[PDB]
């Protein structure tokens, strides 16, 4: 009974802070939401997912920070073990968040405030927020060998573009992240580097509204000729490690 | 005796540098003689000439911009002749620039952004940028990274509408360095925040003043806050620098993967301007630049569609377009048209002011 009451007060504060949209409380309140939604009921958990959804929509209509914060909270909530098992029975789908991330990578590439900054959500840097987003999507802690190859390839190519047009420390961050994804998946993505494995079943559509709509296997990664001559020696070393793993695949 | 005579001689030569054009030539020739003849004497000479150039950019630039440029490209091949000891002095000098930037960032209390943003720091970054650009195409080559580090720090110290022109100038310097070397410097970001400024977004203010010259500005007049003239001026600067950047990298294999982000960002800005600001000149210029970007992306895609990029062999890759030259591309055509137009406008205003002075006399 006492636990129930304390959840009542805590989560009342959480949602009324959310509706107040206090900019400096978002990280902590979202951390609390993520770490107590597993004790909150299932129907209220789905209500939390759609609350995250329409907060992301309101941010769509600072803003990047809020969007990435709600995104990382959504992934953390659904990567909780209980919610992981609840999945299908509870009808919990991340497709909207995946599409939002895929469609916002470009703005995250071209915005300036990327690097003006034990916690899992309340992270002060949009770079590390995006890193958590991409780790959750590309390497979810469960069913690592079940990730859709189309999503894998589309995110890989968009991440390479981000690397070309992102500050240097973020650049090395995504270079290492793609090192990780090629280490884990490999054969699933190697067609994006080999041209004679390129699919000829359409033309790559850059400005797609959905990941499957973007046909990723009809184009190949050409970003090496830019990343090998990027000014940062650490970025160059990360790249050469990338092609080393690609060749040693 | 020997060292003292040498140091007073070079002090006299540095005073001659501080002084007109005939004196420039003579003092530079003497400096050339000194550096060619010369180890310890050579490092002393280059050090003293370094503070000499520092003072020469410490004084001012309203008309002596010619003198500062000539001083710079004259000073460059001194360090070109010296290399190693010059490399060590460049290391320590970039270190002292970095420590100035760092302690200002730390104790940004009061006017740290002021003792950073000046003429001395700007012209110093320009000096090493042009030296490395002229003399890297070795041991001085692996020093660009700290230079880019401090330059980007100077970019993101405080990017306000008052401080637009300084980052325009240092992006010019960075583009010069990128043209000389084969190093990629992301500056489309900074140009896109200049685009995503509130100054050009808000409607302009009707006024009548003189178009400011982006060759002597480190501040902006308080009158130039919402002026349509200043709106337009930053407009052609954004257009021009974007043009140089994208024509600088207009022949690499991965252009479409490198430009579409910027292309769609500028599309979004053009829609936001035409759903705000009313500047049809800027709107048309940015749009037509958008069509050039679409065309060159199509061109490079078509010329790339049939090449092999195997992970164990990049032969057509390492021989992709070595027999192509930077005016064959649509950006090449546009940028040569733009240098012709820009230069004829430069002549227009330069003569205009000359005959104005003659009429006043």
TrEMBL record, chain A:
Keywords: Coiled coil, Nucleus, Ribosome biogenesis. It is found in: Nucleus, Nucleolus. It comes from the Eukaryota. Required for synthesis of 60S ribosomal subunits and the transport of pre-ribosomes from the nucleoplasm to the cytoplasm. Belongs to the CBF/MAK21 family. The keyword Cell cycle does not apply. Residues 67-237 form the CCAAT-binding factor domain. GO terms for biological process: DNA replication initiation; ribosome biogenesis. GO terms for cellular component: nucleolus. It comes from Chaetomium thermophilum (strain DSM 1495 / CBS 144.50 / IMI 039719). This is Nucleolar complex-associated protein 3. The keyword Nucleus applies. GO terms for molecular function: chromatin binding.
Automatic annotation (TrEMBL), chain B:
It comes from Chaetomium thermophilum (strain DSM 1495 / CBS 144.50 / IMI 039719) (Thermochaetoides thermophila). Residues 349-361 have a biased composition (Basic and acidic residues). It is found in: Nucleus. It comes from the Eukaryota. GO terms for cellular component: Noc1p-Noc2p complex; Noc2p-Noc3p complex; nucleolus; nucleoplasm. The chain holds residues 371 to 748 of 788 of the full protein. This is Putative NOC2 family protein. Belongs to the NOC2 family. Its main location: nucleus. Keywords: Nucleus. Coiled coil: none annotated.
